[PDB]
Every structure is written in C-alpha cells, then in structure tokens.
Design a protein around this ligand. Structure first.
Ligand SMILES: CCCCCCCCCCCCCCCCCC(=O)OC[C@H](COP(=O)([O-])OCC(O)COP(=O)([O-])OC[C@@H](COC(=O)CCCCCCCCCCCCCCCCC)OC(=O)CCCCCCCCCCCCCCCCC)OC(=O)CCCCCCCCCCCCCCCCC
Ligand SMILES: CCCCCCCCCCCCCCCCCC(=O)OC[C@H](COP(=O)([O-])OCC(O)COP(=O)([O-])OC[C@@H](COC(=O)CCCCCCCCCCCCCCCCC)OC(=O)CCCCCCCCCCCCCCCCC)OC(=O)CCCCCCCCCCCCCCCCC
Ligand SMILES: CCCCCCCCCCCCCCCCC[C@@H](O)O[C@H](CO[C@H](O)CCCCCCCCCCCCCCC)COP(=O)(O)OCC[N+](C)(C)C
Ligand SMILES: CCCCCCCCCCCCCCCCC[C@@H](O)O[C@H](CO[C@H](O)CCCCCCCCCCCCCCC)COP(=O)(O)OCC[N+](C)(C)C
Ligand SMILES: CCCCCCCC/C=C\CCCCCCCC(=O)O[C@H](COC(=O)CCCCCCC/C=C/CCCCCCCC)COP(=O)(O)OCCN
Ligand SMILES: CCCCCCCCCCCC(=O)SCCNC(=O)CCNC(=O)[C@H](O)C(C)(C)COP(=O)(O)O
Lengths: 104, 69, 178, 88, 459, 56
C-alpha cells in the first residue's frame, strides 16, 4: 500500500465566525455562548473586581497603624514634656538582666 | 474623491470595550453613589475617651462607618 | 522591482549602473545646478573617452579602476529620495497597508455600510475563482519539464484568459492606502 | 491639504515637456511612442540621463533593473502611472 | 479556613453533575465566587498570624498567594475552553477535575501549620500538573518535559523529607509556631551544613535556581495554556514560600552557606536575560524571563532582610500575574497560526489593535515600569542587595537593561513591521480573549493603589 | 413548570452549601480552643452583668 497505517486526515480548524458572525468565542451554541459571556463579565468585572476592591480598600485597621501613631504621639508628648530622651538604646530594663558576674 | 479604506474589523474590539465598560459602570456607579451618601450623611466617628466602667465593642475602635460595618 | 532579474549583469549593465551612481554622487557633491551640470558633462566626456574599446580585458580593468575611484571618492552622505530604501520616508506608510482578505472577516453590520463596494468585490472574487484553474493549466503548459529557469511569467493568450498569478499583483493595497 | 491627485494626461505632458527640453531631441520629431534608440538615434548614456531627468522631475527613484527597458515616453508614463496608482 | 476548602471540594461533584454544555459556565461562575470569598483573608492582624485551628493558619505572606491561586483558576478555565472544544464531555470534566485538585492542593499547601503536611501537599501538587502536561500537551516532547519536571523536583524534595523527619526527632515538633519560638542557632559543622542543604535544595529547584532550571523551559513550553499559567503564576512561588518558612531555623549558617546560591542567582539572571535576546520560540522567552525574575527572588530571600522579603513577596505576585498574561497572549497567536515561532507572524498591530494594546501593557509590566508592583518588588530587592554589598548594583542594572531589551524586542518582533503576506487566517479577537487579558491586567494596576496588601509580614 | 429547571440546575447549590458548612465547621473548630478564654494576662476582663463569655 506504500502506507504505514489507516489514519483520519488532519482536519481544518473551523471558524466560529462562519456560522455565528457575532460569536464571542465562548461556545458553538449561540445561546450558551452569549450566557457564558454574560456570566463571565458579571461575575468578574461586576462582582469580584469592583466590590472586592471596595471591600479591600475599606478593610478595618487591624494592622494597628493608627493606634501605633496615637501611641507614639502620646509617648513623644510625655517624654519631651519632661526632658526625657525620646528613645533608649536599651530595649529591656537593665535591672531585670543578670549578666555573668565575671568577664575574665 | 472619496475612496474605500481597507481596515480590519473594528466591530468586535468596540463591542468588547462597550461590554466591559457597561458591566464595570453597572456595578461601580451604585457603589460610588452609596459611598458619597454615606460620607455626606453618616460621617466618620470622632475620637473620645472611654467612659468609666465601659468596655467598647471591637468594631468601635475604628472611625470609618464602612470599615466599622 | 517589477522585472524578473537575470542570472547575471553584463558588462554594459555594470557600466551604466556605475555611470548613474557616479553622476548621483557627483550631484551630491555639487549642490548647485550649474556646477553640477558642468562637472556632469566633464564626467560624460571622461566616460565616453573609452566608449569604443574592443579589448574586453582592458575595458574590465578600466571598470575596476573606475569602481575603486568611485568608492574612494563617494559621498559619505549621498542624497536619497524620501521613498527610496534609504530615504526618510521609505516605509512610512507600511502600517496603513491592510490586506484585502481582511474584508471577509467584517461583521455583517459593517458590510451593511458600503453595499456596492462589496457587490463589486463579490464580482472580483467570482472572476478570480473562475480564472484560477485556467491560470494553473497555462502555467503547466508553458513550463519546461525541469522547472522554470527564470522568474518571468507568461501573459494571457486565449480570448477570456487572465495572466497567471495576477490576484496579489492587481490587488495591492495602495502606496498611500489611508 | 496636500497636492492634487496625479492624472495620466499630466504625466504624459510632463514627460513630453522634459523630453522637449532635451537638446539631442527635435521638438517636432518627438512623439509619445518615439523610440529612443531607433527613432531618435540615441545611445545608452542618453537613456540613463533621461531616466535621471525623469526621477528629478517626479521626485522619485526608478530602479536600474526597471529603467533599462524604458525606451519610449509611453513606457515611462505607464511606469509612473502604475507606481503611483494612477488609473485615470 | 474550611469556608474556602469545602467549596473548592464541592466544585468537583458540581462539575461532574453538570450538563455537557454547562460545565465551563458553572465552573467559571463558582470559581469566581470562591475567589471572592477567599479575598476576605487579606485582613491581617499585624503582630501575629491568623490561627484558625491546629491544622491551618493564614499569614500576610500566605493570603496574597491564596488570592492569586483562587483568581487564577477562572482565568485558566477561560483560556482552556477554546482548544478543548473538540474533546469529549468526560475528558473535559477530567481536565476541570485536574484543575480543581491542583487548586485544592495549592490552597491547603499555603496554610498548613506543620512542615510534614506542607511537604505532603507540596509533593501532591505534582500529580495533576504531570497528568495535564503529559495528556493534554500538544507536541511529542511533552513526555520528556514531564519526566524532567517530575524528577528534578523529586531529587531535591526527598532529602527535604529526610531532613524534616530528623529535625522533628531532634526538636520534638515541626509546627511552624513552635519552630519559630524555640529557634536555636545552627553550629558550624558538616552535619549542619548538609542539614542546611537538604532543607534548601528542594525550594532551590522549585524556583528554579540557575543551573537547576533546565526542566522549566521544557515543562512551560510543552504544557497546554492552563498548565503554563499555573506553572508560571503559582507553582514557582512554592519554593520561595518554603524558603521564607524554613530559613527561620537555619541561622546563623545562612550567613555563608548562601554565597554560591547568590553568585549563581546573579550571574544566571544575567545569563537568562541574555538568552532571551536570541530565542526563536515565543514561549521559551517567557520561560527564561520567569527564570531571571525568580533568580532575583532567590537573591532577595538569601540576603535575609525585611526589605528583601517585602520585595520578594511583591515580585512573586507581580511576576505571577505578568507571566500568566504573557503566556495567554502567546497562546492567542499560537491558536491563530498553529506555530510558536516568533517571526512567523509579524505586524499583528495592523490586524489586531486591542490585542496589541494588551501586548504593550504586558511588556511594560514585564520590564517593571513605575509605579507598578513589579518595580516595587525589584527596587526593594535591589536596595536590600545594595545594603548587602554596593557592588551588586552593576549586575542589577545590567539585568534591568537586558530585561527592557528583550521585552521590547518581543513586542517589536510580534506586533510591529509589516504583516506576513501568505498568512490570511487571522480572525478578529474574540470577547473571551480580550476579557481574559483584561482580567489579568486590571488587578495588577489596582494593586498599585494598595501595595501593602502584597508586601508581606515584614510590612 | 419548576420541576425540569430544578432537575437541570440543582447543581448551583453545592458550592454555597459547602461554604455554609465550612463556616459552621470553622465555628465548631473555634469551640474546641477555649482553654484560655478570658485568661490571658493582656485581655483578662470582668464579665458584664449579663454576658456569659467574652467570645464564642
Ligand atoms: C470605567 C470603565 C473602563 C475600565 C475601568 C477600569 C477601572 C476599574 C476599577 C475597578 C473598581 C475599583 C474600585 C476602587 C474603590 C475605591 C474606593 C475608595 O477607596 O475611595 C476612597 C475615597 C473615599 O474617601 P473616604 O475614606 O470615604 O473619606 C471619608 C471622609 O472621612 C469624609 O469625606 P467627606 O465628608 O469629605 O465626604 C465627601 C463627599 C461630599 O463632598 C462634596 O460634595 C463637596 C465637594 C466640593 C463641592 C464644592 C462646590 C459645590 C458646592 C458649591 C457650589 C453650589 C453652591 C454655591 C453656588 C454659588 C454660585 C455662584 O463626597 C465624597 O466622599 C467624595 C466622593 C467619593 C467617590 C468615591 C467613588 C469610588 C468608586 C469606586 C468604584 C469605581 C468604579 C468605576 C466607576 C466609578 C463611577 C464612575 O474616594 C477618593 O479617594 C476620591 C479622590 C478625590 C481626589 C481629590 C483630588 C486629588 C488630586 C491629587 C492629584 C493631583 C495631580 C493630578 C492627579 C489627578 C488624578 C485624577
Ligand atoms: C498618567 C495619565 C493620567 C490620566 C488619568 C486617567 C487614566 C485612566 C486610565 C486607566 C488605566 C488604563 C487601562 C489599561 C488597559 C488599556 C485600556 C484599553 O484597552 O484602551 C481602550 C480605550 C479605547 O480606545 P480605542 O479607540 O477603542 O482603541 C485603542 C487601541 O487599542 C490602541 O489604543 P492606544 O495605542 O492609545 O493604547 C491604549 C493606552 C492604554 O495602554 C496603557 O498602557 C495604559 C496603562 C499604563 C501602563 C500600565 C503599566 C505601567 C505601570 C503603571 C501602573 C499605574 C497604576 C495606577 C493605578 C491604576 C488604576 C487601575 O495606551 C497608551 O495610551 C500608551 C501607554 C503609555 C502609558 C505611560 C504611563 C506611565 C506612568 C504614568 C503615571 C502612572 C501613575 C499615575 C500617578 C503618578 C504620580 C502622580 O483606549 C483608552 O481609553 C486609552 C487608555 C488611557 C491611557 C492611560 C495611560 C495612563 C494611565 C495609567 C494608569 C492610570 C492612573 C490613574 C491614577 C491617577 C493619575
Ligand atoms: C478604557 C478607558 C480608560 C479611560 C477611563 C479612565 C477613567 C479614570 C481612570 C483613573 C482612575 C484613578 C483612580 C485613582 C485612585 C482613586 C481611589 C483610591 O484613592 O482608592 C484606593 C483603593 O485601592 C484599593 O484599596 C486597592 C485595590 C484592591 C485590589 C483588589 C482586586 C480584587 C482581587 C482580584 C484578584 C487579584 C489577584 C491577585 C491578588 C494577589 C486607595 O485607597 P486609600 O487611599 O488607602 O483609602 C483611603 C480612604 N480609605 C482608607 C478609608 C478607603
Ligand atoms: C548547578 C547548580 C547545582 C546546585 C549548587 C549547590 C552548591 C553546593 C555547595 C555548598 C557550599 C559550600 C559547602 C560547605 C562550605 C565550605 C566548604 C569548604 O570548602 O570550606 C572549607 C572546608 O575545608 C575543606 O575545604 C573541606 C572540604 C573539601 C572536600 C569537599 C570537595 C569540594 C570539591 C567540589 C565538588 C563539587 C560539589 C557539587 C557537586 C554538584 C572551610 O574550611 P574549615 O574551616 O576547615 O571547615 C569548616 C567546616 N567545619 C567547621 C566543620 C570544620
Ligand atoms: C535535582 C537536583 C537537586 C539535588 C539536591 C540534593 C542535595 C540535598 C542535600 C544533601 C542530601 C542529604 C542530606 C541528609 C539529611 C540531613 C540530616 C542530617 O543533618 O543528618 C546528618 C547526617 O549527615 C549526612 O549523613 C550527610 C552525608 C551525605 C549523604 C549523601 C551524600 C550525597 C551527596 C551529598 C552532596 C550533594 C548535596 C548538594 C548537591 C545539590 C545538587 C547538586 C547528621 O546526623 P548525625 O549522624 O546524627 O550527626 C550528628 C551526631 N554525630
Ligand atoms: C562624485 C564621485 C564619483 C566619481 C567616481 C568615478 C567615476 C568613473 C570615471 C571613469 C569611468 C570609465 O571610464 S568606464 C570605461 C568605459 N568603457 C567601456 O565600457 C567599453 C565598452 N563599451 C560598451 O560596452 C558600451 O558601449 C557602453 C559604454 C556600456 C554604452 O552602452 P549603450 O551606448 O548601448 O548605452
């Protein structure tokens, strides 16, 4: 036969625009295609993007940044109202630290 | 004199742009109007000291009404 | 651009091309018209000095020496026509050229506008489809068995025949398509 | 706007103008179909100069492979008309 | 955390009980709903993480990755349904099942509290990806690509398993909280050196590190569009997340154990950026650009500074989104012309203007134009490296220049010039493709307004 | 009229029911970790005259 095998020929890809000039590229069925486009657009652009961005923008300040700013304002006012340094080089009290008694 | 201009089809890109703008506006115009109405009529809270013997709710430590809700 | 090239250039063709290049570069050097004309007549005289040479070897050597002289004395910035391959407007309008097959993908609402144009396009498409087989048959007939020897194409020879391979030559977009 | 669209009659008139401003051609003798080599008794250098003059006239370059075969004014007119998409 | 996991599982019977013509619609709608639900994890406490239970927790590092995965699933579904139109209903349902299983494994991987569960899910992600690549890949090299992808990963991951069980035996726990609170320094010994290597090399090969990256071009080029999307966007970030979790117990050894990896990452990002300049395949260029970006992420993780981790998190998110968009853009043209060669189809801006706009925006985000989050992460990493050593700026600037070069090279080659004459089957862009590009690009630009959502715990 | 549309569209409840069940299970899981409720040195508090627990 000069052939190696019985194979179907490779078919040509069919254009969705040929049977449906406005076919949205979702499905062969025009109704299913239209509703696929509608659900994609509504649940992506209308629900997730806009409403989710609003929700994220109006997220409550659980990160404690406004609280931190107010606490810093109180501490700074108290410290420079009395002539105390604004910050100590020691984070923890030296009186509760028990260093080794001898260094040599 | 007027001649025909051979161009690629612009119907589909224009339709996609109209659809995207339509859905984005359909969902985001009510949100903008609601935010404006809330801001105008129900403003942000104002800082106050905690009254004696009173414990506030967890949402009462934030000032924007939408964040509080 | 429009003519099928030959396997090689003759001595005569090379001589004329060198003459034209030398004249153009001299015009580039000689900006003014009168001075250019004077030196162009001088170039023409020097070029005609060896017009009637019969020894091909010495003519070839003269051509080589002239080419060396031209290369040494050429203008580094010769004048170029704007639409020429080196011009400032060479491929300026290539982005405005859209192939004609794109008109088949237009929406039916787009084709609602311009109805007569699309009817005439349908006429052209029927013409092409009804001529293609005769074009192929003629090309098969007028071709040597060992394949074509040059890039030349035959004209139409029958009553209602069109020259083979004409669609993409006739349907060029334009030189100023927009 | 820009220059008005070019026409076949204008192309032919300008080609004949340039050729009638050439000294080696009789104005009366010259015709649109007048061959350069045969009827006007010209040589290849004169044809090269005519091609260069046409390029200077119309402000565009003709490739050497195509200019070799422009041996009458009508051929030059046809070449110019087909290159600039002039159909009437 | 169950409120995310359970709907993802419910996606399976829902798509197996759907009609033959409704699977894509149902899956896309409910995947978008699940992404909307998962968007609520971005509310982070600051001081510590959100510990839902003994098994799962959420961090400022995990939440953007979870949101990215949940958002990527619907885009994968939208991209897949075009080339799977001729498939049978059962095989399409199996493909969607593979995607859902991959999503479930990914969402569970990013929230596990304990390292053995993380390892189990992080290995479990292999099977669906392998099945997708080797079953729905287009060419004959997909088998070799799948073998490379599997064995490169496992050769690094098995020593990690041995190291994890040894560490749990020696310490008594692998729960990340106990691991962090009871951290003790690693001494300078050969045993500790090999423990470090066993804890690091798996995440190294998942990034991938330069020199261990050969599996990535094969797997990313030979996979279907959804497979490439998930490989570039999410699966590359598993290594970075694992490194950030695991380097807590590796100090102070990382101080000098990171030198060869830093050298490899910098020089290899230079090498891969250069490689992108001479590439005949459009997908391989995107793959190598991914390799360069992940090399920069590796440097950021290795140097162990807060700015470095912030930049690394931002770069991971931005690279995921940008690489997914670029792969989809390449896939559209491949579906048009059925070839991956870059110079086959030219001057596509004349035929597809809106797709050309999408191409331009994707190329601009790939080169990290300000004030996009790509440059936010890259600039933070570059500043951290400069603090680490002032000589790193030479390599960083060289990489920036070469990145701009090949990005604009790809854009110019694919979109500009004149169209190829004989190619006459380029149809107008579908609504699905434009919507997919928009859904890729809009979150990228929206994240610029709120960069702190993707900067991570060190913020 | 609703029988056939229910039979062909009942699949649209699986995911919302899964979400509700997940929230319910999350609350149940929260219920198992009340060992230190109102017992931390930072948040230990005196109960209101009518409340029973500080959180649920
Ligand atoms: C589009 C399709 C194509 C593709 C689209 C692609 C895009 C996709 C997007 C996806 C969705 C994204 C979602 C994002 C959600 C964002 C929500 C949010 O976070 O809102 C925050 C924020 C809300 O703030 P808030 O936290 O609620 O504030 C509460 C305050 O405590 C208290 O506030 P207050 O008490 O001051 O209240 C003010 C109140 C009342 O204020 C007033 O009325 C007073 C104003 C002055 C009037 C004075 C003149 C008039 C009166 C006098 C004249 C008449 C009488 C006199 C007559 C005299 C005659 C001679 O009104 C307002 O609150 C402001 C308006 C808020 C509108 C917010 C809209 C957000 C929409 C979100 C979704 C959008 C989707 C897209 C579609 C959107 C819809 C089209 O909104 C804004 O940020 C507005 C920005 C204002 C900018 C001011 C100018 C700054 C310029 C600086 C730059 C300079 C250089 C040039 C830059 C130019 C840049 C433009
Ligand atoms: C800065 C100006 C501010 C303006 C205020 C309003 C801006 C609203 C724009 C919203 C975002 C655009 C969406 C991008 C998708 C493309 C849309 C499309 O398909 O066009 C359909 C539509 C319909 O046209 P058509 O006749 O049917 O045919 C269109 C053809 O396809 C072909 O048409 P085409 O060739 O004309 O291409 C369309 C267009 C669109 O393609 C694009 O590439 C536009 C996107 C810009 C590049 C994106 C990546 C770079 C990283 C920047 C990230 C910024 C994010 C900020 C937050 C954004 C919120 C979503 O391409 C361009 O125009 C050239 C791109 C060069 C942009 C260079 C800008 C560099 C940075 C500038 C400052 C950015 C930060 C602002 C604050 C700075 C400190 C004060 O065309 C348009 O409407 C053109 C879009 C307007 C151009 C926007 C360029 C600047 C805006 C950047 C973000 C806005 C920041 C706002 C904050 C306040 C300032
Ligand atoms: C095509 C035609 C184009 C032309 C038309 C253009 C029209 C104009 C376009 C230009 C608009 C410019 C807008 C500028 C911003 C204004 C609003 C801005 O200020 O709000 C931001 C809000 O941004 C959002 O917070 C961040 C965006 C969130 C993005 C989430 C996307 C949803 C998820 C999608 C999936 C994501 C996958 C990947 C995730 C990792 C910043 O908020 P902030 O200043 O602080 O708020 C102060 C007051 N608050 C705090 C009380 C609110
Ligand atoms: C393509 C990409 C693949 C991935 C790349 C992975 C990179 C792995 C490399 C690991 C980095 C370094 C490993 C260990 C650090 C130092 C190694 C050694 O050379 O340093 C000296 C070690 O001294 C000697 O050099 C011993 C090592 C000599 C034997 C190793 C053979 C190296 C040849 C290269 C083989 C290629 C390996 C990779 C194969 C792919 C330091 O002297 P010393 O202070 O006294 O010893 C410190 C250790 N103590 C504290 C326990 C005592
Ligand atoms: C796909 C490419 C990826 C390749 C990655 C492979 C590298 C993995 C890293 C090394 C793997 C083996 C690590 C062993 C697990 C660590 C557990 C541990 O720390 O135990 C050590 C044991 O250490 C060892 O035994 C390690 C010896 C090496 C065994 C196998 C050697 C194979 C080649 C090793 C070098 C290559 C590793 C890096 C190469 C990366 C890829 C090129 C000490 O235990 P003790 O005996 O109790 O000592 C203290 C009390 N006296
Ligand atoms: C501005 C800087 C430029 C300067 C560069 C130097 C310029 C060159 C200087 C001198 C060039 C020469 O002498 S070049 C030597 C010229 N001699 C010959 O060619 C001998 C044989 N002649 C023929 O074959 C034909 O007659 C032919 C002449 C082709 C006409 O053909 P037509 O009649 O059929 O048109």
């Amino acid at each position: 036969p000069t052939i190696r095998l019985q194979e179907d020929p490779d078919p040509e890809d069919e254009n969705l625009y040929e049977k449906n000039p406005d076919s949205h590229g979702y499905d062969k069925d025009p109704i299913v295609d239209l509703w696929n486009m509608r659900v994609v657009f509504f649940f992506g652009f209308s629900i997730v993007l806009v409403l989710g961005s609003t929700f994220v923008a109006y997220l409550p300040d659980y990160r404690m940044q406004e609280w931190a700013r107010r606490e810093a304002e109180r501490l700074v006012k108290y410290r420079e109202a009395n002539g105390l340094p604004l910050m100590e080089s020691n984070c923890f009290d030296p009186n509760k630290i028990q260093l080794p008694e001898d260094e040599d | 004199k007027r001649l025909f201009i051979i161009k690629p089809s612009g119907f589909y890109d224009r339709r996609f742009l109209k659809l995207m703008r339509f859905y984005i506006l359909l969902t985001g115009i009510p949100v903008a109007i609601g935010i404006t109405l809330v801001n105008v009529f129900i403003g942000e809270a104002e800082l106050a000291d905690i009254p004696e013997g009173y414990v506030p709710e967890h949402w009462e430590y934030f000032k924007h009404p939408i964040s509080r809700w | 651009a429009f003519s099928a090239p030959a396997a090689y250039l003759t001595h005569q063709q090379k001589v004329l091309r060198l003459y034209k290049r030398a004249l153009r570069h001299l015009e580039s050097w000689c900006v003014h018209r009168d001075k250019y004309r004077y030196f162009a007549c001088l170039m023409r005289a020097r070029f005609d000095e060896h017009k009637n040479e019969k020894d091909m070897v010495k003519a070839t050597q003269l051509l080589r020496q002239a080419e060396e002289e031209f290369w040494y004395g050429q203008h580094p910035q010769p004048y170029i026509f704007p639409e020429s391959p080196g011009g400032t407007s060479y491929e300026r309008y290539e982005c405005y050229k859209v192939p004609e097959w794109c008109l088949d993908d237009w929406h039916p609402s787009e084709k609602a506008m311009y109805p007569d144009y699309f009817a005439k396009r349908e006429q052209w498409k029927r013409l092409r489809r009804e001529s293609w087989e005769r074009e192929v048959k003629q090309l098969q007939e007028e071709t040597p068995p060992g394949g074509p020897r040059t890039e030349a194409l035959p004209p139409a020879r029958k009553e209602g025949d069109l020259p083979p391979l004409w669609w993409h030559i006739v349907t060029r977009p334009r030189e100023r398509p927009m | 706007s820009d220059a008005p669209p070019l026409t076949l009659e204008a192309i032919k008139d300008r080609v004949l103008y340039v050729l009638k401003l050439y000294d080696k051609i009789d104005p009366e003798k010259l015709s649109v179909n007048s061959h350069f080599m045969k009827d006007l008794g010209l040589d290849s250098l004169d044809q090269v100069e005519i091609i260069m003059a046409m390029e200077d006239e119309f402000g565009f370059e003709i490739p050497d492979i195509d200019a070799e075969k422009l041996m009458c004014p009508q051929e030059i007119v046809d070449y110019i008309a087909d290159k600039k998409d002039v159909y009437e | 955390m169950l409120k995310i996991i359970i709907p993802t599982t419910m996606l399976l019977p829902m798509t197996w009980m759907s009609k033959h013509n409704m699977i894509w619609i149902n899956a896309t709608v409910h995947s978008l709903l699940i992404s909307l639900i998962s968007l609520s994890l971005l509310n982070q406490l600051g001081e510590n993480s959100l510990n839902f239970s003994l098994t799962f927790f959420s961090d400022s590092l995990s939440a953007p990755l979870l949101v990215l995965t949940t958002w990527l699933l619907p885009l994968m579904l939208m991209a897949s349904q075009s080339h799977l139109s001729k498939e049978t209903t059962t095989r399409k349902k199996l493909y969607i099942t593979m995607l859902i299983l991959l999503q479930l494994f990914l969402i569970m991987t990013f929230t596990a509290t304990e390292l053995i569960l993380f390892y189990i899910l992080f290995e479990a992600t292999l099977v669906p990806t392998l099945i997708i690549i080797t079953r729905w890949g287009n060419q004959t090299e997909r088998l070799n690509a799948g073998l490379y992808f599997l064995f490169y990963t496992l050769a690094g991951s098995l020593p990690l398993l041995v190291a994890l069980v040894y560490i749990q035996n020696t310490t008594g726990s692998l729960n990340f909280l106990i691991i962090h609170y009871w951290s003790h320094p690693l001494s300078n010994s050969w045993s500790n050196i090999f423990m470090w290597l066993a804890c690091i090399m798996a995440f190294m090969v998942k990034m991938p590190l330069y020199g261990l990256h050969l599996w990535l071009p094969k797997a990313h080029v030979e996979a279907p569009i959804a497979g490439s999307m998930v490989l570039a966007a999410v699966l590359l970030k598993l290594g970075g997340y694992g490194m950030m979790r695991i380097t807590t117990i590796l100090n102070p050894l990382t101080n000098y154990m990171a030198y060869p990896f830093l050298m490899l990452s910098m020089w290899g990002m230079i090498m891969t950026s250069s490689i992108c300049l001479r590439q005949t395949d459009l997908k391989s260029l995107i793959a190598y650009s991914s390799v360069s970006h992940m090399a920069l992420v590796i440097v950021a993780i290795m140097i162990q500074t807060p700015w470095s981790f912030m930049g690394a998190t931002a770069l991971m998110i931005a690279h995921g989104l940008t690489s997914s968009m670029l792969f989809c853009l390449a896939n559209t043209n491949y579906e048009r012309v059925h070839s991956r060669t870059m110079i086959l189809a030219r001057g596509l801006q004349t035929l597809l203007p809106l797709m050309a706009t999408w191409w331009l925006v994707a190329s601009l985000t790939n080169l990290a134009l300000p004030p996009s989050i790509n440059l936010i992460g890259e600039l933070f990493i570059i500043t951290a490296s400069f603090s680490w050593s002032n000589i790193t700026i030479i390599l960083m600037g060289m990489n920036m220049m070469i990145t701009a070069l090949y990005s604009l090279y790809m854009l110019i080659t694919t979109q500009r010039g004149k169209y190829t004459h004989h190619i006459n089957n380029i149809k107008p862009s579908f609504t699905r493709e434009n919507a997919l590009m928009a859904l890729h690009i809009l979150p990228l630009l929206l994240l610029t307004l709120n960069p702190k959502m993707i900067l991570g715990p060190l913020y | 009229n609703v029988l056939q549309i229910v039979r062909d569209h009942w699949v649209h409840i699986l995911v919302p029911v899964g979400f509700v069940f997940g929230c319910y299970l999350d609350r149940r899981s929260d219920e198992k970790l009340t060992a230190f409720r109102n017992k931390s040195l930072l948040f230990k508090r005196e109960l209101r005259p009518n409340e029973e627990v500080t959180w649920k």
